[model samples]
Target chain A: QSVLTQPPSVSAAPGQKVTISCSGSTSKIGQNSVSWYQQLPGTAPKLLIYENDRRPSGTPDRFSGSKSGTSATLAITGLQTGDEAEYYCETWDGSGGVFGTGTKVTVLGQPKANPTVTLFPPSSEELQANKATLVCLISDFYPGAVTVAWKADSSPVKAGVETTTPSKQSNNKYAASSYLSLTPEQWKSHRSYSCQVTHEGSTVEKTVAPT
Target chain B: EVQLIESGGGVVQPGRSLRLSCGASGFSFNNYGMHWVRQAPGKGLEWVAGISFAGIKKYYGTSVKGRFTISRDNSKNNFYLQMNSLRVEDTALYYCARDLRELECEEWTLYNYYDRGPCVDPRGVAGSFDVWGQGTMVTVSSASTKGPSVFPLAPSSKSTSGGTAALGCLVKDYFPEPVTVSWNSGALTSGVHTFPAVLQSSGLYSLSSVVTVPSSSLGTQTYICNVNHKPSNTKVDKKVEPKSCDKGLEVLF
Candidate 1:
């Protein structure tokens, strides 16, 4: 959990300026230094502002940050289509570092791309050891926000599933993977396994059965 | 490029203790703290313990306050968790994650750069976890009485020849020596080396065994390492299938 609160989203046209606000308590923002990070779609976060308003070397001047009282602001000026991403404010609390509920920044007029889903069965070696793993690969998506679910014979699977965050590919599109773990007995007992991926209000699914 | 690998999955009896290990790489070992999290069967994640950067501080969750110990060896770039008086409820998959502190000096001093009051200037900010280890499962039970827990470690690809590669089996937390290790139910006259079991601080034995096999068999072979503890009537098998290696990267188990 994040201890700081931020707007769920902020939108503006290209070449416009958008300021995202992060609100926190006195002990967090008033006394400690706050930093900002920019996370592009399907990529790791990059440090934009350090120690409240200082930029690290090589970071452009268009990204500015400031703090007043218990609130911090991250301003992106002259925003471009590539600036559509997530912004987060970070600082230290009594226990450890805390991040704000991220704010997604949208550069209007960009199209959203749906993901293609593929499911791969476990390898023969894993099955021989009384274990199984099914991989669900979701690729070529935009906005990088997707949800994944697993089913065994149409029943929801709650455990032994791990889904990765969206990752940026060489072509600049987003991709993600979800793994469903099963025992040999469960794998053989079930008639089919399904992977469901939900993106931007619609859902797509892929199913597989034992041969 | 951050990586963490955890070991020490095994069955421990209630009221006993167990030690798990986490090895870290691809980043500065002393610059960030490490946190431990666990998830019971079909349950949500629970924080277990954490150690600050430079191994200078320790923190624990309310449920495991006095029973869990978190420590690290910077020289080896490894962190360890020792849990005592294990209960059946402790059965879970444990993970280790990196805790980022943006500036190293921030942790040492606490001063507000923007306070405008009469105070010295010391600055820094901490960040969230960005990397994590693939979790390992630990079981706490009364069954199986007493026996060492076993896990297989992948061999270095550089150490492998075009013909062969080596695999290691780690056995820990058992009483007495004279445990038997066999590969695929067959005893090899050659290419098998078992080290002497050493007594740990917990009064338990730990040791490792290595076996060599053709490199071509790695990707396709399902290797099983079986350990038999005749005194306790306990036997357990650990299985691993080696995958193709990256050219310059070490494939950790």
Candidate 2:
């Protein structure tokens, strides 16, 4: 949930136009200024619009922002394939600066691919110690959007889990890793631990157990 | 393989000026922008200044807007942060970072450029600080005092019938962060929210407070914001007589 509301996704063909909207209330968008940011896959957010409608120099004229009443809108014309990214609107409220629910822009005609996931068990040295770490590597994914989950004996596990951001590989494909840490005693006691990755409407799973 | 090395961090006296340097290598100095950030002891990071690629532009945060200068020397592949009028709170770890941007083929065509590296083309669809220099810590010692400059408190939002009215006050450029804010000499409390003091690049502190009240008695009463600086034993007050709005809302300053 976010302080300001926005659509989950918006799509358009290359050379078309798309508008992303952010909705707030009287104490937020109504009374204060708004700014918009763009976040590309695997990258941090960049300021696109400031003070409601001002674009930073070097930004293309195709990207425009506007505000009306309690709503703020970001419109991108001449939308190139490179325009595909997440857009967020920000403003100040009683609690301080607040960001909207981000909207993901998709450029149609782009190819999508699933990732190949591989799980590696704890190393010998790690197994000899009091704790163990498991690694799940996900590679060769397109579009750079994926989610990872861990399970132990079919129960969802979240503690001691860390996932890296999707990184671009040499082939322009995406790769990432998820790590799960646990006590050596627990690793040996569990029947199996599973690593699950979901990408582009599909799931891939890998399981590992004590030798 | 791009690298940034920062230097010029050490002890400094009050009312002094310091120039920090960031040395760059493994890339063209003009290919990317450089930004300076600082973290005071036990505090969060604050962006101080930035020089755009090719020295085309510059930016500064509110804390350093007037007191800091960001410059670059492409011939030397170095960026600099020159800060003036240092104070005690200026003790901080200063860092230099490389600005990042996602580019499109159209942009590349406009620039008549090639990709920097494999899988690094078109940068991305966003921008950020990707590479950072090993930060240098500068400590400013011997601070006695300075008074807080209180800006006029005014209605920050429109006041509507049956709605709430909001007032904001800013306290800035104060030394020794023991400052307090109240409404009508502490008569109002329930709707007041004061932010923590922030250390500025000038080695001073800034704070903000906002208060909300019912709009029913909008024009009948006067609202006041009082700022008390304990270190300087100084007090300041700003008052606003909010006008009642019949057509939606209006901010009466």
Candidate 3:
């Protein structure tokens, strides 16, 4: 299985148009269709296009989608000041659905500061005797709609665990926390423990264990 | 009338990477934007980002800024999306579409000619998505470096936008990074874009993207915004024109 890739940022001015790119492989894009999304500064994410070039009912005709083999593009013409927002691409796969990292769209020029992600229970150290609590915190997320999960040895942790995904952060990124209780024996036996975070179709994983 | 159709089925291992694509037909490749979205088993939806034929990219709602990419090839009318640092939560179905837009006040106008409703997974999951292709389900399980199995269900070709609209995607429950959000359009605004927080439930998270066009730009232009969420992506386009609806004389006879 291969991961998706995206540029970090793309900028444009009002009245001017811009395009964002998403790249994949034969198993994912070369053989399948890709989807696009739009997210504002402080709200949830919304579906922009589905399949490759088809819009969902109620979708405007202005935002169009097109693809060629394993590559895709999302174009926004007649750019306006409000058009400045993040963009992303995604697709389905046997390993599951995957997303590109993401690109920040700046209209009024680059952001004063780039967005940031913060984790709670900030310590990556876990004891082998107590129930471990892992919190993935994100600050500066524009439209808060992020998901979090706990994993053991790369597999989804299906044990006694609770996930807490809070609302959007003041900055832009959303904040979420996951709690799992495991004994030292379980920790020692487990090859690795990790917390995977997702937003839209994109994902990031972090792992921690007794070192 | 441009359209997109996607195949299903993908798999990945833990700590590895995954990639997927959406093919398109029926329209000029340079006339539309490519989008990506993710949905986990029995969950909501997430926006990834958008890509253009010219290779321009934007990250909609993603915080893991350096782990994913969206690219395209207009010659083949196909677009691609890639993700790194694969984990269990990265599992889900995905869809793509062309960009479109419409005005909110009128009923007899249209701009930036484009159609809605693309192909998706039909037999995979239920509720919300109707005309979906047989979805490809992926799982990130243990035992092998190979991740979980992604099942590609049938195709669903339903349109669900206009007026008060809502859409969603599903992603795995456990991820270690922060998700991001973004919006796109061709309008100018003195104020910054501020939206409500997205809703997270049933192991999935969902958000809404909206655009308000000034009457001046109506019927003359189009606007779109691509939302990127780490590994996946999605897009929303709005025509700045009003729909045409004839209100004839009321006849009570």
Q: For this target, which candidate reaches the highest DockQ against the unseen true structure?
A: 1
TM-score of 1: 0.39
Model 2 chain A: worst 10 consecutive residues (lDDT sum): A92-101
lDDT of 1 by residue, B118-191 (tens): 11113321434456677888977665335876655454443355466666566655875568888778754345
What DockQ does each candidate score versus the true complex, computed on alpha carbons? 0.07, 0.01, 0.03
Candidate 3: segments with Cα more than 4 A from true spot: A1-17, A31-69, A81-111, A114-129, A140-166, A169-211, B1-253
DockQ of 3: 0.03
Assess every candidate by TM-score.
0.39, 0.41, 0.32
* Model 2 residue B84 distance off true place after TM-score fit, in angstroms: 20
lDDT of 3 by residue, B1-253 (tens): 4346665346556576666666777656554545565544324355455543344434433433466677777667777666677555666665554443111211222344774222221122111121222234555543321111111110011111122111111112222222332334324331113232222222233222223233233334333333334433323232211222212211112
Give the clashing residue pairs of candidate 2, or none. B102-B124
Q: Tell me the docking grade of candidate 3.
A: incorrect
Where model 1 places Cα greater than 4 Å from the true spot, the runs are: A109-211, B1-28, B31-50, B59-70, B79-253
Q: Write the per-residue lDDT of candidate 1 for residues A135-168, one digit (tens) a residue.
A: 6666667766677999988899978766655665
Per-candidate clashes come to 1, 1, 257
For model 2, what share of native contacts is present?
A: 0.00
Q: State residue B242's C-alpha deviation in candidate 2, in Å.
A: 77
